[PDB]
Ligand binder design. Structure first.
Ligand SMILES: *[C@H](CS(=O)(=O)Cc1ccccc1)[C@H](CCc1ccccc1)NC(=O)[C@H](Cc1ccccc1)NC(=O)OCc1ccccc1
Length: 215
């Protein structure tokens, strides 16, 4: 595979968002992945709605948690494959409470046909990402609260509890690393991003990788 890939360089990644006091990381991970896949399918980069999932995805638990795979399936099976634009369904869960789901007054910004679950292997995940784009992954974010920058070479890897987005990697660096987009504002980490060492399953990054498919 290529030595280094950074999808931000191809204009495929939207700006870092803010989940606030809501445990909606799974929604940001899922939507972030859809935003990138949609752009890669030949459409203009569009900000999509995490609120749609937090409020309407009943197979998940809003601010109490959820699974990116459940989110992908809900979109296809329950929402006719539709994903609203963020402007038409703004995020309003920053306080920790998800307002009721509204089935109208929104605009469809993207559509997906399904999703694939990637192998629990970093080399294989990197190969897929290099050609197909950003991947939604689950990680153990225990060590992430004190992250200020640089490549994290040691990460607590015990229990998956956070959903994020893999936007790239660099195998030619001193210590190969993954480039990850987080949803805790640009004030956290490296302008909202975090780089973790690649190759030793840091933060359990290879355990639950997946991506939406936009036919
Ligand atoms: C987002 C995490 S966060 O808020 O950014 C950081 C954090 C970690 C742990 C505890 C608090 C904050 C989600 C937080 C959920 C939550 C909220 C309040 C208390 C406890 C937990 N994390 C999730 O949503 C995780 C992400 C994940 C995705 C895939 C695989 C493993 C983890 N998912 C989760 O908890 O799902 C539970 C569930 C809910 C509904 C249906 C099935 C499973």
């Amino acid at each position: 595979a290529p030595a280094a890939v950074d999808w931000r360089a191809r204009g495929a990644v939207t700006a870092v968002k803010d989940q606030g006091q809501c445990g909606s990381c799974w929604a940001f991970s899922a939507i972030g992945n859809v935003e990138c896949q949609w752009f890669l399918a030949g459409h203009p980069l569009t900000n999509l709605s995490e609120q749609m999932l937090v409020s309407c995805d009943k197979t998940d638990s809003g601010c109490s948690g959820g699974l990116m795979n459940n989110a992908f399936e809900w979109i296809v099976q329950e929402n006719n494959g539709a994903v609203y634009t963020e402007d038409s369904y703004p995020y309003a869960s920053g306080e920790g409470i998800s307002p009721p789901c509204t089935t109208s007054g929104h605009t469809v910004g993207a559509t997906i046909t399904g999703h694939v679950e990637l192998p629990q292997d970093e080399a294989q995940i990197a190969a897929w990402l290099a050609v197909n784009g950003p991947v939604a992954v689950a990680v153990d974010a225990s060590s992430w609260m004190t992250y200020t920058g640089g490549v994290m070479t040691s990460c607590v890897s015990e229990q998956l509890d956070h959903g994020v987005l893999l936007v790239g990697y660099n195998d030619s660096a001193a210590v190969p690393y993954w480039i990850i987009k987080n949803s805790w504002t640009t004030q956290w980490g490296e302008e909202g991003y975090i780089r973790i060492a690649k190759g030793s399953n840091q933060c359990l990054v290879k355990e639950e990788a997946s991506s939406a498919v936009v036919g």
